[PDB]
């Protein structure tokens, strides 16, 4: 009898960046996987 | 006898991002994944 | 007897970004993937 | 008896962006998965 | 008899940044992950 009121039985997440260029210029409040 | 008012199975989310580009300047509030 | 109220069973979500492009300035409030 | 009162069984989503374009400047409240 | 309130039975993010660019600079408040 699990009987769970709010559950997530699973989640997968990937993500890949990756950046060539140069000289380029951001802000960023959060980045939790950024590159600049 | 799952009996769960509010349930996920499951989630899966794959993201690829490759920046060639050079001298792009841009002003993000959050990026999760976000490349510059 | 799953007796769940909302239930999502499966989700899947692939994004690819490829920018060949630079000298692109641009503003965004928040990118969960985005590529400059 | 699964008994669901509001389900989704799957969902699929597949995004490729690719972009050749420099020079190019754009305003985005929120990409999910934007390209400049 | 589970009978867990909030449960969240797995979550799993991989996330890999590599950077080629050199003169890149940027303002980050907070980077999980983050490449500058």
Do not use: P, T, W
Not at 5 to 11: K, L
Not at 23 to 30: D, E, P, T, V, W
């Amino acid at each position: 009898r699990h009987d769970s009121g709010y559950e997530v039985h699973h989640q997968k997440l990937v993500f890949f960046a990756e950046d060539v260029g140069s000289n380029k210029g951001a802000i960023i409040g959060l980045m939790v996987g950024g590159v600049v």
